[PDB]
Amino acid sequence: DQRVSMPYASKGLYLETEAGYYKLSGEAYGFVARIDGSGNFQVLLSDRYFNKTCGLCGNFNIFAEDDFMTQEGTLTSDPYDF
Amino acid sequence: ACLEGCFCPPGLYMDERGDCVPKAQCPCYYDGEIFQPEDIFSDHHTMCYCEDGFMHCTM
Ligand SMILES: *[C@@H]1O[C@H](CO)[C@@H](O)[C@H](O)[C@H]1NC(C)=O
Numbered sequence: 536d537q538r539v540s541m542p543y544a545s546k547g548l549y550l551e552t553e554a555g556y557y558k559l560s561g562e563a564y565g566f567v568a569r570i571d572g573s574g575n576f577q578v579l580l581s582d583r584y585f586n587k588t589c590g591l592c593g594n595f596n597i598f599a600e601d602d603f604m605t606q607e608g609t610l611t612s613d614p615y616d617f
Numbered sequence: 618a619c620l621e622g623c624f625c626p627p628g629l630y631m632d633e634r635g636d637c638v639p640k641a642q643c644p645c646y647y648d649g650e651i652f653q654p655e656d657i658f659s660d661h662h663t664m665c666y667c668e669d670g671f672m673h674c675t676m
């Protein structure tokens with residue numbers, strides 16, 4: 536809840552600005568986030584979590600149809616209740 | 618038919634406990650079971666929830 540300044544680098548999380556756009560790197564933990572001026576979240580993530588990370592950006596598999604596996608684990612046809 | 622008695626305005630629907638309420642906290646009666654207005658609900662194979670009075674089941 537304490538507002539900090541920027542940039543910021545604690546706990547292996549460099550919180551930087553690149554190309555006038557804000558960045559959050561976690562290369563130890565294998566991810567790089569960022570935002571643009573308008574607001575467009577982006578998440579770069581390694582190959583280490585292939586068929587692991589299940590969430591709102593779906594699994595990191597090859598397929599694209601089966602990447603709605605709910606918090607229970609259920610292939611759903613709706614992109615909404617998921 | 619068009620009967621006579623004690624009703625309450627259309628925005629309000631009847632609750633079991635004598636008052637009538639909007640459809641926000643109007644429970645569901647799935648399989649007889651009186652579920653509260655927010656009760657996420659599932660066996661292994663189905664998936665079901667009560668939103669505003671209606672019981673939204675899926676599979
Ligand atoms: C992903 O992992 C699951 C659970 O272990 C396994 O059932 C499935 O075959 C794997 N799929 C791929 C593409 O490796």
Ligand SMILES: [Ca+2]
Nearest residue numbers: 594596598602
């Ligand atoms: Ca996928």
